[PDB]
């Protein structure tokens, strides 16, 4: 709630919203999901992978 609602005249580099009502803007929740992308079933010769 600090780094995401810049005021009028602040630096909006790392903010998300900016306006004259930004002192009362807040999050309700933040959800995240991570998806790993990999290569399964690696080829195996002799001397290992």
């Amino acid at each position: 709630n600090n780094t995401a609602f810049a005021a009028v005249g602040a630096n909006p580099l790392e903010a998300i919203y900016q306006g004259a009502g930004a002192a009362d803007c807040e999050f309700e929740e933040i959800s995240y999901t991570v998806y790993q992308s990999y290569l399964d079933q690696l080829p195996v010769g002799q001397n290992g992978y």
Binding site: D40, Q41, L42, G48, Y49
Partner: protein, 84 residues
């Protein structure tokens, strides 16, 4: 393969200001020793089977036996007394 102008020739290159000679010489970049990290597992729980498959299915059989074969009461022919 240019042709020399005899009326207006020119000479070789003259010295010009230079680009601070050490700043065109690079450092040789200094590699440290490295390691493929961790103790590797011996096998992997693969998502596909590693063997062959069959394109078509073939019908298989197994032998069976019949049973104890019995006798019969035949209908028996007539005697060939020159009518037959």
């Amino acid at each position: 393969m240019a042709l020399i102008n005899p009326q207006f020739p020119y000479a070789g290159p003259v010295p010009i200001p230079g680009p601070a000679p050490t700043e065109t010489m690079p450092l040789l970049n200094y590699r440290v020793e490295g390691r493929i990290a961790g103790i590797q597992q011996a096998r992997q729980f693969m998502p596909f089977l590693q063997g062959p498959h069959r394109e078509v299915a073939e019908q298989t059989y197994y032998a069976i036996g019949t049973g104890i074969q019995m006798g019969q009461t035949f209908n028996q022919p007539l005697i060939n007394t020159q009518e037959g």
